[PDB]
Design a protein around this ligand. Sequence first.
Ligand SMILES: CNC(=O)[C@H](Cc1c(F)c(F)c(F)c(F)c1F)NC(=O)Nc1nnc(S)s1
Ligand SMILES: [Ca+2]
Ligand SMILES: [Ca+2]
Ligand SMILES: [Ca+2]
Ligand SMILES: [Zn+2]
Ligand SMILES: [Zn+2]
Ligand SMILES: [Zn+2]
Length: 165
Amino acid sequence: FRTFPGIPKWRKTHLTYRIVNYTPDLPKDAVDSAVEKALKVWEEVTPLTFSRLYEGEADIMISFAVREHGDFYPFDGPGNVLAHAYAPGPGINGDAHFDDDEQWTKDTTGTNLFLVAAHEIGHSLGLFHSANTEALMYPLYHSLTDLTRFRLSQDDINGIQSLYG
Ligand SMILES: CNC(=O)[C@H](Cc1c(F)c(F)c(F)c(F)c1F)NC(=O)Nc1nnc(S)s1
Ligand SMILES: [Ca+2]
Ligand SMILES: [Ca+2]
Ligand SMILES: [Ca+2]
Ligand SMILES: [Zn+2]
Ligand SMILES: [Zn+2]
Ligand SMILES: [Zn+2]
């Protein structure tokens, strides 16, 4: 497993999140559930807890966007980069942004929202990329994971326990 340089991490155990806007690609309900399921994967193996906000600034702000959207890293249209998340800390830190030029599905063939969201939150909690082929944090996880058999690897679990306990 790998962490980000200097090992940034959250200094409280109770975190909040807000879903700012929605993709045209799926129904609202389908989006809420992909996101709640992604957060539960990580809540099971750490002493952190998550709660939702509908107004104000939450620790993790989630939003959908295309091309330039307010930071140093512009989206690139269809394919290539699919999303991007920042390491723990104030302001933009911890936030996750999804490229709306991709086609978000609930399918096992295509760009799955739940899968990508579980990987990006890993970044938001403090983990970088792994070299273990079975890991949720290996760079090619989106092509290699069988959603019928989904599970965090031992490497994922080892990595998150070294930061949070
Ligand atoms: C403390 N360092 C970070 O928080 C970096 C900052 C950062 C960017 F956010 C970024 F978009 C980018 F292109 C960079 F080159 C870059 F350095 N965050 C991540 O690499 N996030 C990722 N999300 N999904 C991945 S797959 S990798
Ligand atoms: Ca934030
Ligand atoms: Ca793209
Ligand atoms: Ca789209
Ligand atoms: Zn507190
Ligand atoms: Zn961004
Ligand atoms: Zn990544």
